[PDB]
């Protein structure tokens, strides 16, 4: 609440818990972490500004 | 000291008669005798009502209000037996004192009052009731001519200037208060707070006067100085630099 009027906020909880921890792991997963880790940092982005 | 005394129970014709008296010895003492007379004069709202008095024993119909049509020429000779003289080493300064009826800024004597004199100063009953004394509203009080009563050779260069500062101050105070009682402290910037506490120590050692406090003009400056340094220079603006050097850094 600002000057007696509300208004909402989100904030983003990480659960600690995954189910693609490993997928591929004979093939190669390194540049799918670097996209989970960019699109982590992007729902973070995305959140704030919803 | 000259007491002249008149009761209520007393003559009606009487009333009407003191002043003029009062006024007669303050002239004699301030020419004759070149002094420097302080006349202070009280409840004119009753003198008002003698002249009432007189006026149906005149036979006269009533004017405005009831009061008689002629009251502007009597209490301007009152008024204007005041000032400073060629030749001469004396003054006469008049106060008196107003009952304003009923809060009403429009019965005829204030404003003829206001109309005759030069400037007026206001007191204020939730002052009275906050049990601050003496109760005086300085935000409406307005003295006429002090740019000249007051500056430097006479006293300390900046008066003035501190009365200025003061007055803005307060007026600042008091709109960010007002803002404040809607808004909230969640929204409210340090300077702001600041400001509040310079309100708040203002009414309580500025106004407050105390009945028995003998007090100087040189040190009720260093009260001033000491309230307006609370802030920094920063927002001291109107001011002068060249001038704040005297007490600001202190």
């Known amino acids: 609440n600002v000057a007696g009027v509300t208004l909402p906020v989100f904030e983003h909880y990480h659960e600690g818990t995954d189910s693609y921890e490993l997928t591929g792991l004979a093939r190669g997963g390194e540049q799918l972490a670097k996209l989970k880790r960019n699109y982590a940092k992007a729902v973070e982005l995305l959140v704030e500004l919803a | ?250």
Request: charged share 25%; net charge negative; with cysteine.
């Open chain 2, 1 to 250: 000291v000259c007491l002249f005394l008149n009761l209520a129970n007393d003559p009606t014709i009487e009333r009407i008669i003191t002043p003029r008296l009062a006024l007669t010895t303050a002239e004699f003492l301030a020419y004759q005798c070149e002094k420097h007379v302080l006349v202070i004069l009280t409840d004119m709202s009753s003198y008002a009502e003698a002249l009432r008095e007189v006026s149906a024993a005149r036979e006269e119909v009533p004017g405005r209000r009831g009061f008689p049509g002629y009251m502007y020429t009597d209490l301007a000779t009152i008024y204007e037996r005041a000032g400073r003289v060629e030749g001469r080493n004396g003054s006469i300064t008049q106060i008196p004192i107003l009952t304003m009826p009923n809060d009403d800024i429009t019965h005829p004597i204030p404003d003829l009052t206001g109309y005759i004199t030069e400037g007026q100063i206001y007191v204020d009953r939730q002052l009275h009731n906050r049990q601050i004394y003496p109760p005086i509203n300085v935000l409406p009080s307005l003295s006429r001519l002090m740019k000249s009563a007051i500056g430097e050779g006479m006293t300390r260069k900046d008066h003035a200037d501190v009365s200025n500062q003061l007055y803005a101050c307060y007026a600042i105070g008091k709109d960010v208060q007002a803002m404040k009682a809607v808004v909230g402290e969640e929204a409210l910037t340090s300077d702001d707070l600041l400001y509040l506490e310079f309100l708040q120590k203002f009414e309580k050692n500025f106004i407050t006067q105390g009945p028995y406090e003998n007090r100087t003009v040189y040190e009720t400056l260093d009260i001033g100085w000491q309230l307006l340094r609370i802030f920094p220079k920063e927002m001291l603006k109107r001011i002068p630099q060249s001038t704040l050097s005297e007490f600001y850094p202190r």
